[PDB]
């Protein structure tokens, strides 16, 4: 249905976050999406109505940069090679830029769905 994650309950307890930081570092290094010069939010599926609407509300600069990044990544994937270690996606630039818009759209849809189902309890 939708992606799920226990990414907040662990944040509730600081000790669990402190314990799981190195494992998350190693896992993100092992994933290897940064070797293609991409960002994580690019890989999210866009085939429903929510993400299609969200992608049309981004700033123009973000859309153009995303288009260039995707095209360069696919051009590299054509020849089965990666960029040198200098041109890798640094952690500072690997921020979440699509999640808030999707959250806003989902909130709007959920509000409409809530209004849809109502009852009168006298």
């Amino acid at each position: 249905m939708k992606p799920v994650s226990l990414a907040k309950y662990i944040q509730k307890s600081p000790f669990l976050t402190k314990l799981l930081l190195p494992i998350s570092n190693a896992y993100v290094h092992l994933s290897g999406y940064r070797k293609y010069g991409l960002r994580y939010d690019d890989l999210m599926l866009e085939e429903n109505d929510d993400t299609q609407k969200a992608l049309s509300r981004l700033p123009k600069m973000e859309s153009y940069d995303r288009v260039y990044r995707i095209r360069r990544a696919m051009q590299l994937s054509i020849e089965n090679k990666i960029l040198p270690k200098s041109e890798w996606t640094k952690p500072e630039e690997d921020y979440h830029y699509l999640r808030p818009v999707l959250a806003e759209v989902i909130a709007e849809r959920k509000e409409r769905e809530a209004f849809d189902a109502l009852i009168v309890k006298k």
Binding site: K60, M61, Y64, Y68, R71, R72, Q75, I78, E79
Partner: protein, 245 residues
């Protein structure tokens, strides 16, 4: 299962027909056919091979006709019912010793000599297993006894064969002149049975070489042509002119 009830693993040899560019040994084929006719034509049936098959492989046409003209066959109805025997033709199958399976069972205790047309291809080992079975008759070791009507043979499943030693020393007189030991004769019989299983080996292995060569050349050309056509895409260059507002 238990090693006794599954038999001994067959030995491995090298045959001329097992290579990649080799056919049969037709002299061995003819000698094996002679041994077959003079030994196991009495009980084992090969009712899937015609006299015309041996023409041009182990015998000439005149030889095949002369040899086949000595077997009496049964033909269709006469002018008033009846059934009349024939001197044999070149389009008949080799004669089966028994008229039906029940007669074979009655004659040989309770066993049933299997048909030899497709036995080599239908056994776990083929030529090696058949040769080892033929040459593997030994006296039983202490502790295991064989009842009357059975023989000890480790290569047979259960180590109890219903046969007797079929190939003794100097059982057949070879036309070529080779001595007829229990090793040479078994090898020739195995070769002939393998031929009877797959008579099309020579033509198949002759066609395969040319087919493989042509296909290899075609594949080698395709691997180059794809790289030729797919060149202006694998070597693209993409530049990003940042769109300043």
């Amino acid at each position: 299962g238990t090693p006794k009830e599954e038999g001994l693993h067959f030995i491995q040899h090298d045959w001329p027909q097992s290579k990649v560019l080799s056919g049969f040994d037709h002299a061995s084929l003819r000698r094996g056919f002679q041994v077959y006719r003079e030994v196991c034509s009495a009980c084992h049936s090969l009712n899937l091979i015609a006299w015309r098959h041996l023409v041009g492989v182990t015998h000439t046409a005149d030889e095949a006709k002369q040899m086949a003209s000595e077997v009496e066959y049964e033909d269709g109805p006469d002018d008033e019912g009846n059934m009349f025997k024939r001197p044999g033709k070149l389009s008949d199958f080799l004669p089966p010793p028994y008229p039906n399976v029940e007669a074979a069972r009655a004659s040989n205790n309770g066993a049933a000599p299997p048909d030899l047309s497709c036995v080599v291809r239908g056994r776990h080992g083929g030529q090696d297993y058949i040769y080892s079975l033929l040459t593997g008759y030994t006296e039983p070791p202490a502790g295991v006894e064989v009842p009357d009507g059975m023989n000890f043979n480790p290569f047979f499943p259960g180590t109890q064969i219903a046969m007797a030693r079929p190939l003794f020393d100097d059982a057949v007189e070879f036309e070529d002149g080779t001595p007829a030991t229990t090793a040479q004769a078994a090898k020739d019989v195995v070769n002939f049975l393998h031929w009877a299983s797959e008579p099309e080996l020579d033509i198949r292995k002759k066609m395969g070489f040319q087919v493989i060569t042509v296909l290899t050349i075609l594949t080698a050309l395709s691997m180059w042509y794809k790289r030729f056509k797919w060149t202006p895409i694998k070597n693209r260059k993409i530049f990003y002119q940042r769109p300043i507002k």
